């Protein structure tokens, strides 16, 4: 009977970086997804493996909400089978992903006039991430032939670069808050149900 805390996820004051993306378990509550799809706040609402209007009619188990902040033109990489820096080094979705990817512009919240540097992305990594794998290691990357031994130098960089989030930047360089919902469809005893 108790409502799912979707207001604690979407209306949170602070969102994580994409390399350290936060995952929240939604469980043992009634979920009303009709107030999310009919809300005009979300610019991107793409659902995979489920219709968005059928969400109220299903019961889900293992519901997870992954929240982070990425820049504007990289929202297209939060999808199965995409390539680039966010998909390969920061946040990878599986090819058999079922769930919904929700994103909206947050330029009025996550941009400071001098530049907001609290959001960082992993620019460099030795290998591609597995799906739903988090890498928070800050080991010094080797971009050249000479080994670094944990010390920066020529072709030795810190792997995390911060976004420069300013309000003057156009759409595409503007911050977008991305919440990814993930479900399992009718195979276990379900704790999250629509009304």
């Amino acid at each position, epitope marked *: 009977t108790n409502l799912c805390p979707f207001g604690e996820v979407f209306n949170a004051t602070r969102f994580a970086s994409v390399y350290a993306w936060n995952r929240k378990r939604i469980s043992n509550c009634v979920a009303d997804y009709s107030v999310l799809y009919n809300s005009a706040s979300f610019s991107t609402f793409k659902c995979y493996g489920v219709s968005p209007t059928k969400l109220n009619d299903l019961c889900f188990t293992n519901v997870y909400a992954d929240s982070f902040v990425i820049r504007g033109d990289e929202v297209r990489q939060i999808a199965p089978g995409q390539t680039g820096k966010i998909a390969d080094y920061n946040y990878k979705l599986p090819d058999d992903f079922t769930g919904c990817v929700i994103a909206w512009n947050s330029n009025n919240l996550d941009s400071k006039v001098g*530049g907001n*540097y609290n959001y*960082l992305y992993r*620019l460099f990594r030795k290998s591609n991430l597995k799906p739903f794998e988090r890498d928070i290691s800050t080991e010094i990357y080797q*971009a*050249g*032939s000479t080994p670094c031994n944990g*010390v*920066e*130098g*020529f*072709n030795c*960089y*810190f792997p995390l*670069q*911060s976004y*420069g989030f*300013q309000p003057t930047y156009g759409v595409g360089y503007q911050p977008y808050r991305v919440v990814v919902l993930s479900f399992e469809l009718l195979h276990a005893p379900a704790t999250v149900c629509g009304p």
Partner: nanobody, 124 residues
Framework: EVQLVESGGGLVQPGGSLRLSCAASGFTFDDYAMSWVRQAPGKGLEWIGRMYNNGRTSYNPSLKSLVTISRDNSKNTLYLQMNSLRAEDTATYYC??????????????????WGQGTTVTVSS
């Protein structure tokens, strides 16, 4: 035109302190990593340090105790504050931008644009 100019070098007594500048043209430091590199007369290029866009600094660990890298984004200058210049600091100091983007081939230094560099001499 992407251009780096350095200034502030010259004669300096041993044990003193001296500041350098890396006035930039054609771009700003808000989205680029900028580095200081030292060239000794008898040795190769020695990496001094690096400023990232968020303002964090990394230094040469054999040189950390006597250098300081600071920005002034209002005038797009990168500053390099030496302290206690000794005889092996007599060198030509270049300021160059790190290439964290596309590299067309293998680069020994990873620098897409260099400065002309300024000469600092420490003697009697």
């Amino acid at each position: 035109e992407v251009q780096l100019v350095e200034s502030g070098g010259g004669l300096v007594q041993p044990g003193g302190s001296l500041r350098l500048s890396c006035a930039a043209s054609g771009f700003t430091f808000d989205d680029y990593a900028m580095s200081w590199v030292r060239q000794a007369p008898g040795k190769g290029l020695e990496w001094i340090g690096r400023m990232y866009n968020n303002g964090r600094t990394s230094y040469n660990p054999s040189l950390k105790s006597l250098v300081t890298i600071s920005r002034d984004n209002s005038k797009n200058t990168l500053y390099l504050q030496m302290n206690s210049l000794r005889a092996e600091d007599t060198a030509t100091y270049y300021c160059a931008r790190d290439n964290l983007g596309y590299r067309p081939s293998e680069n020994l230094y990873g620098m897409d644009v260099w400065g002309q560099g300024t000469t600092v001499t420490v003697s009697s």
